[PDB]
């Protein structure tokens, strides 16, 4: 999980993704790929072999041909990199990558996370807060805020 290593790879991604404008498409490619990577019986086999060509070919081969030429030459980069083993991490990055542009999500307050796409901190946020009306759900909230205020409280008891 170097994953920081992602960037030069990961970075050119968005750019190619930007340039190639695939991100719908490229996004597809990534979905497909992480899928491919996931394959465990394959995985045992996956570090098996020395010849990079062999893997580009075989991997690309059973793949179901979701591949792109830019992603062929480039996949050839990751294998030539030999680093390719860990690739799926980038999708996470890619997510943020995709996310980066214009996105937003949410952290559950005490219940469940809206992940609302709201780009104004504490504003678009506030918009969601007010937007409750989702005010209904408990979902452990009370134990949480009462226990957390209670936590600041006993914290002061200690302070007392």
């Amino acid at each position: 999980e170097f994953i920081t290593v992602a960037r030069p790879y990961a970075k050119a991604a968005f750019d190619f993704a930007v340039e190639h404008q695939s991100v719908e498409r490229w996004q597809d490619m990534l979905a497909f790929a992480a899928e491919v990577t996931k394959n465990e019986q394959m995985a045992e086999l996956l570090s098996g072999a020395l010849a990079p060509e062999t893997l580009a070919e075989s991997f690309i081969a059973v793949a179901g041909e979701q591949l792109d030429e830019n992603g062929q030459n480039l996949i050839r980069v990751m294998a030539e990199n030999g680093r390719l083993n860990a690739l799926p991490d980038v999708l996470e990055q890619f997510i943020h990558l995709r996310a980066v542009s214009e996105a937003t999500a949410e952290v559950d307050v005490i219940s469940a996370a809206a992940l609302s796409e709201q780009q104004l901190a504490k504003i678009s946020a506030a918009m969601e807060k007010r937007l409750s009306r989702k005010v209904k759900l408990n979902a452990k909230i009370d134990k949480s805020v009462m226990a957390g205020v209670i936590i600041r409280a006993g914290d002061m008891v200690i302070d007392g």
Binding site: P8, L74, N81
Partner: protein, 508 residues
């Protein structure tokens, strides 16, 4: 890791598909202090010089997969990374001409004097293979000591491995240096290495080149503090190119070399740069690989030299090449792997003793502290002849020391020995700067031949009596020419000596 481009990844993103473009000149990704990771100039020649922004060319030894980088002597800071490379087609070569004897130059042969004149022919790479076996002729050619014990202590044929070994601050840059003078009017051609030296040394040196006004019979290059090690790393190899133009010119030469180690660990700093594991003290495993290269160079060719460059406009004759090692020791530690590998390497050995230096004795060296396998082949039937007692006196005086401790244990037989040894001891003397007559060598024989010891018995009067002696020469000095000329031992000639002993009676 090395990949690192990411932006060219964008390039390579699809360009992994298509490349097939070999520049002579690739961009130099990033640099440290003259050395740069770089990519391009797809074709490789190992150790190829590589032109740069500005005249400079550089080189890298390490074949480095998928990218490589290199450094160059020069301003390293001006440059900017990723510049299109400047390919240099030639591996480095150095100008080769026989006309520099009066002028010295930067590592480039750039005259630091700025003589402005250029007498040299073409240019030629610094390092090259040595001559075949048996292509060498053994050479009896003597040499002029000027320290009596230099020749008397040791003979010198042309071509031998020198030693100088001795402590820092011992005098041994001018104990080392002071040596160079005796050469003088010799007429053989020579150069002196300089490792990193302080300039004032250079200047005053030049003044000495007024002292010996000569200064032009032979030239020497220089190394200074600003200098790039690469300059040094080749600098011995650099001079190698030239003296090869004398031996290769059929000429016979000696070239001083000293203070290498400075260069050496500098080459370690290369290894740090090389990010490559060194040996102890960060010493390159190379070591005797380098020393192999440079040290390997010196020779006295045989009429195999009849095969010449012109091979031959004959001149079917044998060339010979000598040179000067100087070593230095902190605390006088023999463990020095440098002195180890080197010590092993040396053909003959020279040690200076900070005792006699500490004695302030004119010489600091110790009998048997310094030895040479070459031996007395160079020593002349007279010179060879008369020279024996040294060792014993050495021993003796040395051995004499033994009872000195037990005070007053000994009788006159001893006292005659010991006295004689004090006497010889005295007999050793030398100026800080003096030329040597070597007819003066004949002088010594008296103490052997002439009783001469009882005479001028007085310490002061012995000493002075040396001078007075020297003077008396003017009274008669016809045969010395012949003597100086003859260079041979004639029993009949010994008469002239016997009678000279009268002039001793004559001169006080």
């Amino acid at each position: 890791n090395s990949t690192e481009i990411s932006e060219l990844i964008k390039q390579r993103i699809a360009q992994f598909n298509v490349v097939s473009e070999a520049h002579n000149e690739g961009t130099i990704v990033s640099v440290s202090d003259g050395v740069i990771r770089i990519h391009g100039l797809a074709d490789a020649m190992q150790g190829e010089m590589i032109s740069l922004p500005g005249n400079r060319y550089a080189i890298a030894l390490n074949l480095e997969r998928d990218s490589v980088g290199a450094v160059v002597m020069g301003p390293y800071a001006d440059l900017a990374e990723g510049m299109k490379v400047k390919a240099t087609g030639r591996i480095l070569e150095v100008p080769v001409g026989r006309g520099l004897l009066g002028r010295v130059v930067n590592t480039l042969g750039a005259p630091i004097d700025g003589k402005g004149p250029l007498d040299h022919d073409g240019f030629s790479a610094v390092e090259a293979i040595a001559p075949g076996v048996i292509e060498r002729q053994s050479v009896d050619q003597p040499v002029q000591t000027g320290y009596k014990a230099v020749d008397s202590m040791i003979p010198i044929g042309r071509g031998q491995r020198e030693l100088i070994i001795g402590d820092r601050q011992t005098g041994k840059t001018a104990l080392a240096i002071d040596a160079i003078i005796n050469q003088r009017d010799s007429g053989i051609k020579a150069i002196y290495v300089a490792i990193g030296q302080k300039a004032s040394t250079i200047s005053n040196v030049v003044r000495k080149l007024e002292e010996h006004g000569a200064l032009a019979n032979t030239i020497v290059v220089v190394a200074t503090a600003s200098e790039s090690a690469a300059l040094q790393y080749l600098a011995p190899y650099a001079g190698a190119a030239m003296g090869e133009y004398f031996r290769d010119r059929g000429e016979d030469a000696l070239i001083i070399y000293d203070d290498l180690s400075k260069q050496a660990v500098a080459y370690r700093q290369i290894s740090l740069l090389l990010r490559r594991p060194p040996g102890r003290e960060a010493f390159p495993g190379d070591v005797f690989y380098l020393h192999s290269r440079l040290l390997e160079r010196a020779a006295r060719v045989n009429a195999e030299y009849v095969e010449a460059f012109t091979k031959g406009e004959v001149k079917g004759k044998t060339g010979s090449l000598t040179a000067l090692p100087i070593i230095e020791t902190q605390a006088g530690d023999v463990s020095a792997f440098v002195p180890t590998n080197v010590i092993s390497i040396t053909d003959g050995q020279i040690f200076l003793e900070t005792n006699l230096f500490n004695a302030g004795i004119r010489p600091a060296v110790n009998p048997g502290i310094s030895v040479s396998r070459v031996g007395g082949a160079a020593q002349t039937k007279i010179m060879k002849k008369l020279s024996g007692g040294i060792r014993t006196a050495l021993a003796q005086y040395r051995e004499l020391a033994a009872f000195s401790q037990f005070a007053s244990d000994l009788d006159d037989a001893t006292r005659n020995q010991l006295d004689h040894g004090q006497k010889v001891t005295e007999l050793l003397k030398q100026k800080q700067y003096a030329p040597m007559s070597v007819a003066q060598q004949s002088l010594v024989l008296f103490a052997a031949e002439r009783g001469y010891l009882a005479d001028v018995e007085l310490s002061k009067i012995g000493s002075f009596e040396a001078a007075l002696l020297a003077y008396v020469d003017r009274d008669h000095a016809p045969l010395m020419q012949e003597i100086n000329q003859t260079g041979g031992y004639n029993d009949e000639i010994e008469g002239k000596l016997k009678g000279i002993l009268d002039s001793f009676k004559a001169t006080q």
